[PDB]
Amino acid sequence: MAGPEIVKLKKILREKAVPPGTEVPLDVMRKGMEKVAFKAADDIQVEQVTVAGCAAEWVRAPGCQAGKAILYLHGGGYVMGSINTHRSMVGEISRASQAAALLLDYRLAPEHPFPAAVEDGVAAYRWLLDQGFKPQHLSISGDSAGGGLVLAVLVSARDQGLPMPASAIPISPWADMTCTNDSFKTRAEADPMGGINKMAARYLNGADAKHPYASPNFANLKGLPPLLIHVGRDEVLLDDSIKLDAKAKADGVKSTLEIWDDMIHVWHAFHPMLPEGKQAIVRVGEFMREQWAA
Incomplete structure (x- = not known):
């Protein structure tokens, strides 16, 4: 069977949940994500930096190896999330990986599509390279929309002559704005989390939804560094992940897909x-470390 903690949490997530279809204004989804956010661990230290004209924080757990770093890209459908919403989970990734995180406040849609x-x-x-x-x-690591971005940034950095980093960890990546994959129909009644279609709409602002940099499941992945992909079995976006793993391996990329039973979208966050x-975060970190020692 299935861990009790996930059963409890699924129960809670279905209660707190807004009923299907009802139209929640943006600045209400935004503020609500900010209010429910977990506070980071008391031993996580933080330093405000500005990077490429964006607010950011370095998020250093105890034990960071000098010289190593994680570019971290937070989730929120490209329309929400913030340094604040992700500080906790990212604090723990820093812990598991023995590496400081650069936690970027990238420009959000629809203000900036x-x-x-x-x-x-x-x-x-x-900036990091400089x-x-x-x-x-x-x-490079990131979750949900952030997971897509991780891939998008790799592909775009590559196209620009930038060197690929040592590893990349999309967590529950959203890598297909078209939102047409089986797992939306198949895995629907199991993900407690046209609301996601709205986000694609806000993000793209008229753009080709099969744009390589918007939906990296349609991009040329040739030459990306080794990938760990986490995804839960009980999420809508399972296919995004499976198709990403197949795409990567087809393009020569060293991909490792782990589908975790009973799990939900970015379950990490509920560590x-x-x-x-906590388990999957520890693994994210082990893999970043595994990749750095080779």
Whole structure:
């Protein structure tokens, strides 16, 4: 059977949930994400930086190896999320990986549509290189929309001559704005999380939804660094992940897909109360470390 903690949490997530279809204004989804956010661990230290004209924070857990860094891209459908919403989970990734996180406040839609977010990530990446981190000492990670961005930034950085970092970890990536995959119909009644279609609409602002940099499941992945992909079995966006793994391996990329039973979208984020949460973060970190020692 299935861990009790996830059952409890699924129960809670279905209660707190807004009923299907009802139209929640943007600045209400935004403020609500900010209010429910977990506070980071008391031993997580933080330093406000500005990077490529974006607010950011370095998020250093205890044990960070000097010279290593993670460019981290937060979720929120390209329309929401913030440094604040992700500080906790990212704090723990820093812990597991023994590496400082650069936690970027990239430009959000609809105020700043695509490719604004990709422009910010690529530039965030340039900035790190200019600060003297060696591509082989770098990693890129992100969740939900952030997971897509991770890929988008890789593909775009590559097209621009930037060197690929050592590893890349999309968590529950959203890599197909078309939102047409089976798993939307198949896995629907199991994901407690046209609301996602609205976000694509806000992000794209008229753009080709099969744009390489918007939906990286349609891009040329040739030459990307090794990938860990986390996804839960019980989420709508399962296919995004599976098709991403197949796409990568087809393009020569060293991909490792882990589908985790019973799990939900970015279950990582619920690490405080969900042991699989902490488990998968620890694995993210082990893999960033595995990739850096080779």
